[PDB]
């Protein structure tokens, strides 16, 4: 169903999604 969406997919949303995709920081070297 093609029909005008509600809010939008503006850029800042993309930049925030990518910044929160924050998995490349990764887990710390394990203390033993």
């Amino acid at each position: 169903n093609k029909a005008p969406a509600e809010v939008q997919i503006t850029a800042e949303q993309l930049l925030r999604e990518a910044k929160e995709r924050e998995l490349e920081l990764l887990p710390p070297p394990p203390q033993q």
Partner: protein, 114 residues
């Protein structure tokens, strides 16, 4: 009763901040004229040496003394550790920074391009 104030300014040279810190530490110290006179009556004229004048090999300190300087060391070290006050992790504003290096580079750019 007493009153004074000292305002902070530009770090202009590391020397200025060092000097301020020395002022504070110097004002703190309180010396015992007892030990001074005790040390005095032993050595007398040796007390007043020019740069080049007089010489006695070494003055050996009671350990209790050494503890004073060690304690002051730890104090100044802590006070210096607090040099940079960190701004709390505020997520409230818009995020256009991929990581913390990028976030800080964007902040430096904010301060040079208005």
């Amino acid at each position: 009763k007493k009153k004074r104030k000292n305002p902070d300014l530009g770090f202009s040279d590391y020397a200025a901040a060092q000097l301020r810190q020395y002022h504070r530490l110097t004002k703190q110290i309180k010396p015992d004229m007892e030990t001074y006179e005790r040390l005095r009556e032993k050595h007398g004229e040796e007390f007043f040496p020019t740069s080049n004048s007089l010489l006695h090999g070494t003055h050996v300190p009671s350990t209790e003394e050494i503890d004073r300087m060690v304690i002051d060391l730890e104090k100044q070290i802590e006070k210096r550790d607090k040099y940079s006050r960190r701004r709390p992790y505020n997520d409230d504003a818009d995020i256009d920074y991929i990581n913390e290096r990028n976030a800080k580079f964007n902040k430096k750019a904010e301060r040079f391009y208005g």
